[PDB]
Structure formats: structure tokens, C-alpha cells
Amino acid sequence: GFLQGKKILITGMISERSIAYGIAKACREQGAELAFTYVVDKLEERVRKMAAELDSELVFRCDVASDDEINQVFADLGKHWDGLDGLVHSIGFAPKEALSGDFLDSISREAFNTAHEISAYSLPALAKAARPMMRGRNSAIVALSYLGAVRAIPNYNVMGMAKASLEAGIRFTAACLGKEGIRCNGISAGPIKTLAASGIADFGKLLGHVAAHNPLRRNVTIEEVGNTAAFLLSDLSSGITGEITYVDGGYSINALS
Amino acid sequence: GFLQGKKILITGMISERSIAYGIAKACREQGAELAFTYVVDKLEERVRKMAAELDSELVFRCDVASDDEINQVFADLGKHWDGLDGLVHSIGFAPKEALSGDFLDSISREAFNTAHEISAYSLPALAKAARPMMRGRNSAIVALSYLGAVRAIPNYNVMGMAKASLEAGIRFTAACLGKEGIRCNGISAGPIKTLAASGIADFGKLLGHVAAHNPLRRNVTIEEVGNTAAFLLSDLSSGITGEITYVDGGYSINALST
Ligand SMILES: NC(=O)c1ccc[n+]([C@@H]2O[C@H](COP(=O)([O-])OP(=O)(O)OC[C@H]3O[C@@H](n4cnc5c(N)ncnc54)[C@H](O)[C@@H]3O)[C@@H](O)[C@H]2O)c1
Ligand SMILES: NC(=O)c1ccc[n+]([C@@H]2O[C@H](COP(=O)([O-])OP(=O)(O)OC[C@H]3O[C@@H](n4cnc5c(N)ncnc54)[C@H](O)[C@@H]3O)[C@@H](O)[C@H]2O)c1
Ligand SMILES: Cc1c(CN(C)C(=O)/C=C/c2cnc3c(c2)N[C@H](C)[C@H](O)C(=O)N3)oc2ccccc12
Ligand SMILES: Cc1c(CN(C)C(=O)/C=C/c2cnc3c(c2)N[C@H](C)[C@H](O)C(=O)N3)oc2ccccc12
């Protein structure tokens, strides 16, 4: 496969419905060796199990709210790996109450700060902590974004501001690290029913809307997202950096439907 | 590889420097079976010889000025192949004098009409002619664009208008064909010293500028473009349609490079 020899760290894999699971599966299918992070101690067993099915025993606790925890991942991983070829950012969070209802009524300073720190700052923070292991390796970062970065969407509210910050982060990270042989790209995925859809009322209606309106007349899968991530983590994509690739079956490019 | 057994028709391969040659070599490396077009009789032997080195003896004349020739390609190819999995558009042309100097002084009606017919109309025209063969196969189209579509660039002049038309054509073709299982995407490549650069003055200066300013601090290769095309032609990219992907080492996303 086209990721033979690559060693890739994957964040955000919490269940088999996670986008990060689709990414991990697609990467392992292409020959990569994987390592994983998980946010709280409570999740360790589930993540070790999924990791084991993908032939990995390399699992590390990481709350991206914590500079120390982020740094410790790379310290620990560096004892097993000579370097890091791929880094997958698949972390997005805002307080649930900020993701329902009128944008201004639902926003607060605290929710804004949390959403941006966890969903956007985490990309430069991870890239910076990974830099010693990634520099000079012709390596690559992939982060997951969503249409709310560039379009107003009902209920997505402050997460759209956070995604816009993330996508600018992708550009600035790519501009910073390209000379030393690290690429940084985004995927803007169409909606997928993961654990992110939990408590998001009418997610089903969103899915039906996208499948009724997009060129492919269907919703995307975690496999389709994951195969695109695999490509972006591979040397096949060596001419691409700072890019946001839409894996939404063409949804964003249609109007007047 | 990930195009094993896929049948792909490639336009625009005229030398080993061509973008289309990079795409061909990348697709063959992933297992595809290839077929090729050439614009005029003068080129037939060169392209047949290149094709043979890529394990193909399927080569067809096609000047995209001619609807007869465009549709004749697929009639002839259809005698060999029961269907088509991939279609590569790597064709761009404007009169040389329209590509030098002041945009308005250099433009003319004839040059505008030629640039748009050859460089933009040829994408829907080829997609339309290929539709019967490509239908229902989870097949894919890839076309080459350039940053002039979306940014003003010295000397590129009317070709920028033609590339804008082309990129809209990619979106409209994607929206048209998606229900029938055909995807259509673009690659916006960084500058490359192909035969296209011949007769373009100071092309080396343009290359130097891009390598000085882009995130990667280097120009891209036809191999990099080709591997992206291979991905976009494959089922790995089945969630992507109507997209323009920049293979320019990040050049387009940088500013204020002093
Ligand atoms: N599901 C969709 O429709 C969709 C579409 C496009 C983009 N996205 C984005 O894709 C990414 C993955 O989401 P998903 O849908 O797979 O959901 P998911 O809930 O499976 O994954 C989100 C992950 O973020 C992690 N996370 C949250 N806070 C964290 C913290 N402080 N530190 C570390 N990890 C933390 C969670 O533990 C979880 O693993 C997110 O960035 C999301 O915004 C989702
Ligand atoms: N070289 C660059 O810097 C660059 C960067 C981005 C995009 N592009 C685009 O890539 C494509 C391929 O160009 P290239 O750089 O590989 O140069 P090239 O000269 O190798 O290929 C151009 C091709 O266009 C064909 N063509 C011209 N008029 C035609 C006609 N009437 N019918 C059929 N074919 C015709 C030529 O015969 C040739 O094969 C073009 O669309 C070009 O605009 C080039
Ligand atoms: C699409 C789409 C998505 C799916 N999507 C594109 C996302 O980025 C989701 C992000 C998200 C962030 N924080 C959460 C989320 C999801 N969900 C539950 C509640 C989680 O436990 C939590 O407490 N915070 O999320 C939406 C939210 C509103 C409107 C549309 C969408
Ligand atoms: C980059 C860049 C490119 C390279 N590029 C991105 C192109 O699309 C080139 C297009 C092209 C079209 N018609 C031609 C061309 C090139 N060259 C010779 C003369 C050919 O034989 C002919 O008679 N017409 O071309 C440029 C032209 C001007 C400014 C910048 C660029």
C-alpha cells in the first residue's frame, strides 16, 4: 500500500463511528503503522482494544487543553519511533448549549474560548509539539474541518468560528513548516453520523438535505474521508500543502437546489 | 495499485515533459490500462511511441476544435473497450500574441474565442462525448487548471478568463453527472516547464518567484501532479466531486511575501 513505512499518530478515535476510525482503518489498509491518543482515562480500555485490532499497542492519554499532556505524548512516542511521518487532528468540541438555537443567544465568552482552544488552537499546539519528530521526514499533518468555516449554518454557531480559525491555522502551519519538510492540509467532510451528532436535534434532517442536494445524491462515509486522509498523509500528495479538500460529495459547490 | 484494471483515456501527452505524461506514468504505476489522443497527424508517431512505452497501442487523433473528431475518438475506442473508467483533460491553448504584454492591448475577439473553445469548452465537450462509455461505472474525469482562473496574473491574460470558464465547467459537469456515477474534478497546478512554457518569455523568472515564495520553497513536478490525478481518478476519491485541488506547493495560499 502507499503508506508502507509511514508511522502515523491519530487523535480523536473514540468509537468505530469516529471519522478518526475511518482514517485509521484506511491508513492501516495502505500499510501504515499507527499510534493513538485518547482524551480521558475513562476511555483507555476501549481505545486500546480498537488500536489492537489495527495492530497497534501505542496509545497515549492526551487532553489538548494541557500543554504538558501534549508534550508528554511526543516524549513517550519518541521512545518507540525514530520520527513521526503523519499526524491526524480529528478533535472538535464546543459546549453543547452553544450548538443549539439562535447564534447570539447561545454564545458566551467561556463557550467561545473553549470551542476555539480545543477545536482550533489544538492544531498549532500539536504541530509545534510534534515538530522535532516530524521535521526533515517529508511528513504530513491532516486536520478535519467543516463547511461552517466558510458558510453560516443553523445551530453550528460558535463551532463555525472555531473551524474558520482552524482552517487559517492549517494555512499558517503549512507556511511555517513547509521549508523543513512538513505539509499541513485539511479535509472539510460532509456530515456524518458519529458521536458528534449526539444531542444535535434533527441531524437526520441535515443528512437528508445533503443527500438530496449534492451532486452524488448521497452522504459520504468515514471510509471516503479516511481514504482522502491516507492520500494526504502519503508521498503521493507531496505537491499539496495548505489545502482544504472537500469530501462532501460536491455539496459545497451546488446552489439553488 | 489502486487503479488496477481501470481503463483511462488521456489527452494532451506530447512529450515526456507534458503534465499528461506525468499523469500517464502515475496511472500506469497504479495498474491502469491507458489510451491516448493527439491533436494533429504530425504528432501521431511520437505519441504512439510514448504510448507503447506505457503499454498501450490505443492512440487516436483528436483536435478539440472538431466535434466530428471528438466523437470519433469514442466510436473508435469503443471497438476495444466496453466502457471507460477515466478521462484526463490536459489541453490548453491561446494564440501566443494574446499571452504577452498588456491584457487589453493583447486581447482580441478571435483570440478570446479560440482560447475559450480549446481550453474551456473542450471539457464539457469531451465529458459529453464520453458519457455513454463512462455511465454507471463509478468513473472519473480530471482536468488541469491554473491560478489565473481566480487571480489576475501578468501576461497570462485571456487564458485566465478561459481557465475560470473551465473551473465553472468542472463544477457544472460534476453536478450534471454525479447521479450517474461519474465524478469530475480539477487540479490547479503550479507552473511547470513544459512545451507550454516555450515561447513564454521569462518563464524561468516565474519559476524562481514561485520557489522563493511558496510554503515548500520549490516548484512542483509532473509526478506530483500525476499522482494527484491518479488519486482523483481512483475510487479512493469517491467522496470528492466538483473540486479544484491545488498542486502548487501551497503557492496560492501565501501573501505579503517580501
Ligand atoms: N461528524 C461530522 O459530521 C463531521 C463533519 C466534518 C467535520 N467533523 C470534525 O471531525 C472531527 C472528528 O469528529 P467526529 O465526528 O469523528 O466525532 P467524534 O466525537 O467521534 O470525535 C471527536 C473527538 O474529539 C475528541 N476530543 C474532544 N475534546 C477533546 C480534548 N479536550 N482533547 C482531546 N480530544 C478531544 C473526542 O474525545 C473525540 O475523540 C472533529 O473536528 C469534527 O468537528 C465532523
Ligand atoms: N505548464 C504549466 O505551468 C501549467 C500549470 C497549470 C496548468 N497547466 C495546464 O496543463 C495542461 C497541459 O499543458 P502542459 O503544460 O502539459 O503543456 P503541453 O504543451 O505538454 O500540453 C498541452 C497540450 O494541449 C494540446 N492541445 C492544444 N491545442 C489542442 C487542440 N486544439 N486539440 C487537442 N489538444 C490540443 C497540445 O497538443 C498539448 O498536448 C493545459 O491545460 C495547461 O493550461 C499548465
Ligand atoms: C453538521 C453538524 C455537526 C457535526 N460537525 C460537523 C462537527 O464539527 C461537530 C462538532 C461538535 C462539537 N462539540 C460537540 C458536539 C459536536 N456534539 C456533542 C453534543 C458533544 O457531546 C458536545 O458536547 N459538543 O455538528 C453540528 C452541530 C450543529 C449543527 C450542525 C452540525
Ligand atoms: C504559468 C504560465 C503558463 C503555463 N500555463 C499555466 C498555461 O496554462 C499555458 C497555456 C498556454 C496556452 N497557449 C499557448 C501557450 C501556453 N504557449 C505556447 C506559446 C504555445 O505554443 C501557444 O501557441 N500558446 O503560461 C503562461 C503564459 C503567460 C504567463 C504565465 C504563464
Residue numbers in the entry:
A (entry chain B): 4 to 260
B (entry chain A): 4 to 261
Which statements did the authors publish about this structure?
Co-crystallisation studies revealed the binding mode of this chemical series within the NgFabI catalytic pocket as a ternary complex involving the FabI active site, the NADH co-factor and the inhibitor. Key increases in potency were achieved by expanding the right-hand side lactam to a diazepanone, from which the extra nitrogen provided an additional interaction with the enzyme via H-bonding to the carbonyl of A199 (compound 1; IC50 6 nM). Inserting a stereochemically defined methyl group on this diazepanone resulted in supplemental Van der Waals interactions with the lipophilic environment of the active site (compound 2; IC50 2.4 nM) while its enantiomer was 5-fold less potent (compound 6; IC50 14 nM). The introduction of a hydroxyl group in a suitable orientation to this right-hand side reinforced the interaction with the NADH co-factor via a conserved water bridging network (compound 7; IC50 1.9 nM; water bridging network similar to that shown in Fig. 2a). Finally, bringing together the stereochemically defined methyl and hydroxyl groups enhanced potency, resulting in Debio 1453 (IC50 0.6 nM). Interestingly, Debio 1453 also interacts with the NADH co-factor via Van der Waals contacts between its benzofuran methyl and the reduced form of nicotinamide, and via a H-bond between its central carbonyl and the ribose hydroxyl of NADH. These multiple points of interaction between Debio 1453 and both the enzyme and its co-factor may account for its sub-nanomolar NgFabI potency. The NgFabI co-structures described here achieved resolution of 1.3 Å, higher than those reported previously for S. aureus FabI (1.8 Å)21 or E. coli FabI (1.5 to 2.7 Å), which provided sufficient detail to leverage the interactions of the right-hand side hydroxyl substituent with a precisely defined conserved water network binding to the co-factor NADH phosphate, thereby reinforcing non-mutable interactions and increasing potency.
One such untapped antibacterial target in N. gonorrhoeae is FabI, an enoyl-acyl carrier protein reductase enzyme that is essential for fatty acid biosynthesis in this pathogen. Inhibition of FabI, which is an enoyl-acyl carrier protein (ACP) reductase that catalyses the essential rate-limiting step in fatty acid biosynthesis in some bacterial species, is an effective antimicrobial approach for various Gram-positive and Gram-negative bacterial pathogens. Importantly, FabI is essential for the growth of N. gonorrhoeae and its chemical inhibition cannot be overcome by the addition of exogenous fatty acids in vitro, underscoring FabI as an attractive and yet untapped antibacterial target for the treatment of gonorrhoea. In the current report, structure-based drug design using novel N. gonorrhoeae FabI inhibitor co-crystals guides medicinal chemistry toward increasing potency in the sub-nanomolar range and drives the discovery of Debio 1453.
